[PDB]
Design a binder for this molecule. Structure first.
Ligand SMILES: [Cl-]
Lengths: 74, 82, 78
């Protein structure tokens, strides 16, 4: 269940791109993860029933900084 | 009888940093749909078709060709708006 | 440089698994994206550069479960 979600996160990443990607890709509800922007400094997450609050707090716990740029129905 | 007009679209993901592939492909064994995805027009890909790797070429209208094992085929069609 | 992106598609066996597979694949060097695709949502499509598909399959088989390489192609960037 759920409407399809698109979430875009700006991540610090300085050692950590692989770590952010692994953590986001392991998250429940996630169908796709992609690095976006020319500098691959944003993560686009798409899927169903993803909790963006836990995701952001888990990314901050393990990669330092993480901001939501977008949450929308995809 | 294989009829692509009656096949549901594949489950796909277009990577945003590369051009959108113009074709859907559909893989059949004895006319039973096995799976489906996307591929570029006027291009090529290596795909496992049953037991064999097959070099599959696409023309400008998503017609696919290759040495498919007996019983197997991969067919292409243009995605909407392409 | 003018080097084209890779597209690799891997079928993963399912259990309590697709999530561990996605995490392992996403953690690999040069990966731009991972997506669960296919009629049964049991295939991972990976896009990137400098990915060794044989080493990736070995890694998956070792740390997660059975996996079969289904596609290796290049992105048409022309
Ligand atoms: Cl292709």
């Amino acid at each position: 269940p759920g409407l399809k979600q698109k979430i875009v996160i700006k991540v610090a990443m300085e050692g950590c791109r692989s770590k952010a990607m692994a953590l986001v890709a392991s998250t429940g509800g996630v169908d796709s993860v992609a690095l976006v922007g020319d500098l691959r400094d944003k993560i686009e997450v798409v899927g169903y029933g993803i909790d963006p609050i836990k995701l952001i707090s888990a990314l901050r716990k393990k990669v330092g900084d993480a901001e939501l740029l977008q949450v929308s129905q995809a | 009888a294989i009829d692509l007009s009656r096949e549901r679209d594949p489950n796909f993901f277009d990577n945003p940093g590369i051009p959108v592939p113009e074709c859907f492909w559909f893989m059949f064994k004895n006319n039973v749909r096995q799976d489906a995805g996307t591929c570029y027009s006027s291009w090529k890909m290596d795909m496992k078709v049953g037991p064999n790797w097959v070099h599959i070429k696409s023309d400008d209208n998503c017609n696919l060709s290759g040495d498919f094992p007996p019983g197997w085929i991969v067919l292409g069609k243009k995605r909407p708006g392409f």
